[PDB]
RNA sequence: GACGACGUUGAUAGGCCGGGUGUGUAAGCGCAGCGAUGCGUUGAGCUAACCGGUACUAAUGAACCGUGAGGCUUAACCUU
RNA sequence: GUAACGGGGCUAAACCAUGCACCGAAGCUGCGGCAGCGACGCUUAUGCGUUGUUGGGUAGGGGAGCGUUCUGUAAGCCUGCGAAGGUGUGCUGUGAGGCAUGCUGGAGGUAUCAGAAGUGCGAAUGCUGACAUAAGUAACGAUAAAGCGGGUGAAAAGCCCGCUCGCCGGAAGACCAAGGGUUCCUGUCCAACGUUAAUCGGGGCAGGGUGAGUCGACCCCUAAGGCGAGGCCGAAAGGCGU
RNA sequence: AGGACCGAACCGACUAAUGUUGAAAAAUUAGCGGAUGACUUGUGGCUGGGGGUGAAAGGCCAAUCAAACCGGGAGAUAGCU
RNA sequence: CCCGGCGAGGGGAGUGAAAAAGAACCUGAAACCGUGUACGUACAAGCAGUGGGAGCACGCUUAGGCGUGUGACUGCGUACC
RNA sequence: GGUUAAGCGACUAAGCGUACACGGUGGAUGCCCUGGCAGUCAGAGGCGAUGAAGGACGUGCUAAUCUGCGAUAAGCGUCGG
C-alpha cells in the first residue's frame, strides 16, 4: 500500500524516461495562401487545400 | 552576441514546463516557434512569450538578425511554492503546494 | 448533524456579558485578570 | 501503446441504391356504423450493428526520419 | 528446486600407513616509526648514550589535550592595499585541529599568558522551520444534461444575448424570525481566493444605497425565574427572602 | 370513545449495501417503526463536578465522563523505558 | 525605449562604490531541483565501499612514464544506534 | 588487389551515475540594535464621588490605523523658558 524505503532520483528519472513529448514531424503548406498548418486541418485564415474553405 | 529573457514566478510546476523546453533546446528560432504553436499544452504558451521576448530584445538592444538566431540555452528552475490548506475527511487538513517556475531562454547567433 | 454552538445574542450576554460578570465577586475577578493581561475585548458584549 | 486494412492508379469509414431481417396492415383519404371501432387502399409503413454494390463526403500535393558500397587478422579460392 | 562432499567433478582428487616438500593468520622474524612503565650512568637545572619490556578492549577508573563564546593583558596588534562569515586549493600534526592562499563578502577581528562557561549532537515515536518521497499518481464534492449561433475579449465548454433541451415545482419557488453583518446595486480590475479556464463572482478597489404617528423595537402589563432596601441566617466570602 | 387502525408532514433509527486519507470526526440510498400522544417543537428559564440529571445504559452534563473543562499546587512521583 | 493582455514578468538605458544591493532587496550555508562538460553504463545480481587495476579525458611536462576526474574487470565485504 | 569462410571487434544512451562549472530554491552563519534580562544609587510609595483604574464613540485640509485630545476635542488662557 505504501513504500518501505524512499525511492531515489535515479528511479524517478527512469520512470520519466517515457514522459517526453513528441514534436510535430512537419507542418503542411497550403497551395494558395502558402500558410503553415497541421495536416488534414484548416489554416488560421480559413484555407484548406486551396479552396477558400470557411473563413467567417 | 547572446541575449536573455525570463519569466519569473510563473504559475506552473517546473516539471510540466521542462517537457516543453526539451523540444526546442538547440533548435532554430523559426523552427521553435512552429513547434510551440502546435504543442497542446499550457506551458507552451508561456515559453513562447519568453522566446518571443528574447527575439525582440536581440533585435532592439543587440541589433541582431532573426534568421540567424538559435536557441542555445533554455532551462526551468523551481520557484517559490504557495502554501494552501485542503480540508480532508474526519477533520484532517492537508497542505497544497501551488508550485511556480522561473523560465529562462537564451538565444544567440553563433 | 446538530452541532454544539447554536448562537443567541441574548443568552450570550446574559451568561458571559459585562453586567453578568460585574454581578459576582468571581466575575469581577475575571475582568481584573483580563485587564491585567491587557485584553482588548474583556467580554462578549459587542 | 501495439497488430491488421486502406488513403483518389482508391470501396477504408459514413452516406446513398438494392436486398434481407424484424415488427405486423403506417399516415392520408374513402366506406359502414349514433359512437367507441371496423373494413378497403395494404403484409402496408418504418427498419440499428447484416449482405451485395455505389466515389456523393472525408481519407491532399508534399514534408520528416533513414544515406552515399559497409572494420582488422588469418586461411582457402580469382591466380584448383 | 538438484538440496545428506560448499560446487564442478573425482575410481582417485576416497580410506589406512610412512616420508619428503610447499601453501597458509593482524602469530613469529626482518626494516622504519610513535608512545607507556621499568630499571641503568646520581647521570642532571634531563635528555639520552643506552637498556630491556609493554601497548585488543565494554561498564568503569586514571592521565593528557583540541576547539568554541565571553573578561583581562588590549586606547596594544591585524584590517577598505579588504575583518568576520561563506566557498575552493595547497601544506602540516598521532588525533580533536592548525597555517597560508584564490574567489565571494564589504567591517570589524584579535596574538600570547591567564580567567569564567548557556563549551562541541545523527539518534530521545526529540523541538521549530525548510525541502523531498510516494506522483504529476488519487481526486476535482450527489449520474437534474446539455447543444448551437452571435457578442465581448489577448484568449470563451463555463460570462452576456438568443433559439432549443433537460431538472425542481408542499420546492431546488416566494416572504420572515434566529443568526450573520454590506455578502445588496453600479463601475472597474484578474495577482491571490473559486478544487479547471475566466472577460465572470458572495473575490480586489472605489462610489452609491436602508426615508414610518399606523410594520417591529423602545414603551405600559405581567409568567417561569432573576436581583433584592430593611430583615432572618451564616467563620469571612456569602445564602434565603419581604 | 381510544397511550385504537392504515398512512405523508414531523419525531425516530430495525436490516442491507455504499462510504471508511468519506460528500459527512456516524452520513447517503432502498426498505423499516411511531405518527391525538408517556407525542413533538420554538423562545426563555432552573439544576454544577464526588455534584447534577437519569422510563437506569454507568447513560448524558459543549465532537471530552467509573468523576467535565480552565488555571494553579507543579519541574507531583516514576526502583520503569 | 523594447517584447507582453494600455498586463504579470523580463531585456536595455540611467542612478550608485556596488543593482550577482532593485524593494520576493546586507551577508546568502545545507537539504532539495536543474542546465552544461568529461568519463562510465543496456549478458549483468546483493550495505554500493575497500584493495588491486586497464582504458579515456585533461593539466603538467626543459619527453621525465607525475597530478586531477572517471572506474571496464577483479579479491574481500550483510548499515548505524 | 577481388570473392567466400572463420575468428575478433570499437563508434549507440531512451535514461541513469560520479566529478567539476554555472544557477534556482531556501534563509543558516557572521556582522548590527531605538528591544529585553539582572542589578546598584537615588526617588516616589498610592489613584478615586472635584467621578478613578480601564474602556466605547468621537475629534484633522484626512479614507484608515497609531499617538494626543474631548463638542473650547493632534488642542484654549496665563506665567516663564
Curated annotation (Swiss-Prot), chain B:
Keywords of this entry: Antibiotic resistance, Ribonucleoprotein, Ribosomal protein, RNA-binding, rRNA-binding
MF (Gene Ontology): large ribosomal subunit rRNA binding; structural constituent of ribosome
Family annotation (Pfam families): Ribosomal_L22 (PF00237)
Gene: rplV
GO biological process, alphabetically ordered: assembly of large subunit precursor of preribosome; cytoplasmic translation; cytosolic ribosome assembly; response to antibiotic; ribosome assembly; translation
Organism annotation: Escherichia coli (strain K12)
Descriptive protein name: Large ribosomal subunit protein uL22
Ribosomal protein is among the record's keywords: yes
Outcome of swapping residue 91 to A/D/S: Abolishes translation elongation arrest of SecM
NCBIfam families associated with the record: rplV_bact (TIGR01044)
Family of this protein: Belongs to the universal ribosomal protein uL22 family.
Binding positions (L-tryptophan): 90
Summary of subunit composition and partner proteins: Part of the 50S ribosomal subunit. In TnaC-stalled ribosomes forms part of the binding pocket for L-Trp with the leader peptide and uL4.
Reported function: This protein binds specifically to 23S rRNA; its binding is stimulated by other ribosomal proteins, e.g. uL4, bL17, and bL20. It is important during the early stages of 50S assembly. It makes multiple contacts with different domains of the 23S rRNA in the assembled 50S subunit and ribosome.
Any further remark recorded for this protein: The wild-type allele (erythromycin sensitive) is dominant over the resistant allele, and is also dominant over the temperature-sensitive allele at both low and high temperatures.
Cellular component aspect of the GO annotation: cytoplasm; cytosol; cytosolic large ribosomal subunit; large ribosomal subunit
CDD domains: Ribosomal_L22
InterPro entries in the cross-refs: Ribosomal_uL22, Ribosomal_uL22_bac/chlpt-type, Ribosomal_uL22_bac/org-type, Ribosomal_uL22_CS, Ribosomal_uL22_sf
SUPFAM superfamilies (UniProt xref): Ribosomal protein L22 (SSF54843)
Gene3D superfamilies reported for this sequence: Ribosomal protein L22/L17
From Swiss-Prot, chain C:
GO biological process: translation
Molecular function in Gene Ontology: structural constituent of ribosome
Membrane-spanning parts: none
Cellular component aspect of the GO annotation: ribonucleoprotein complex; ribosome
Keyword Ribonucleoprotein: yes
Keywords in alphabetical order: Ribonucleoprotein, Ribosomal protein
NCBIfam families recorded: rpmH_bact
Family, per entry: Belongs to the bacterial ribosomal protein bL34 family.
Official protein name in the record: Large ribosomal subunit protein bL34
Amino acid at each position: 500500500a505504501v513504500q518501505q524505503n524512499k525511492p531515489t532520483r535515479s528511479k524517478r528519472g527512469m520512470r520519466r524516461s517515457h514522459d517526453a513529448l513528441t514534436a510535430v514531424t512537419s507542418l503542411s503548406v497550403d497551395k494558395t495562401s502558402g500558410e503553415k498548418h497541421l495536416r488534414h486541418h484548416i489554416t488560421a485564415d480559413g484555407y484548406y487545400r486551396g479552396r477558400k474553405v470557411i473563413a467567417k | 552576441m547572446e541575449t536573455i529573457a525570463k519569466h519569473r514566478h510563473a504559475r506552473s510546476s517546473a516539471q510540466k514546463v521542462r517537457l516543453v523546453a526539451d523540444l526546442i533546446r538547440g533548435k532554430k528560432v523559426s523552427q521553435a516557434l512552429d513547434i510551440l504553436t502546435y504543442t497542446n499544452k499550457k506551458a507552451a504558451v508561456l515559453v513562447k512569450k519568453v522566446l518571443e521576448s528574447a527575439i525582440a530584445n536581440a533585435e532592439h538592444n543587440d541589433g541582431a538578425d532573426i534568421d540567424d538566431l538559435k536557441v542555445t540555452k533554455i532551462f526551468v528552475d523551481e520557484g517559490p511554492s504557495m502554501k494552501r490548506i485542503m480540508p480532508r475527511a474526519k477533520g484532517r487538513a492537508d497542505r497544497i503546494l501551488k508550485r511556480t517556475s522561473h523560465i529562462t531562454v537564451v538565444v544567440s547567433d553563433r | 448533524m446538530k452541532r454544539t454552538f447554536q448562537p443567541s445574542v441574548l443568552k450570550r450576554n446574559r451568561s458571559h456579558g459585562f453586567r453578568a460578570r460585574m454581578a459576582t465577586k468571581n466575575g469581577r475577578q475575571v475582568l481584573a485578570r483580563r485587564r491585567a493581561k491587557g485584553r482588548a475585548r474583556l467580554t462578549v458584549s459587542k
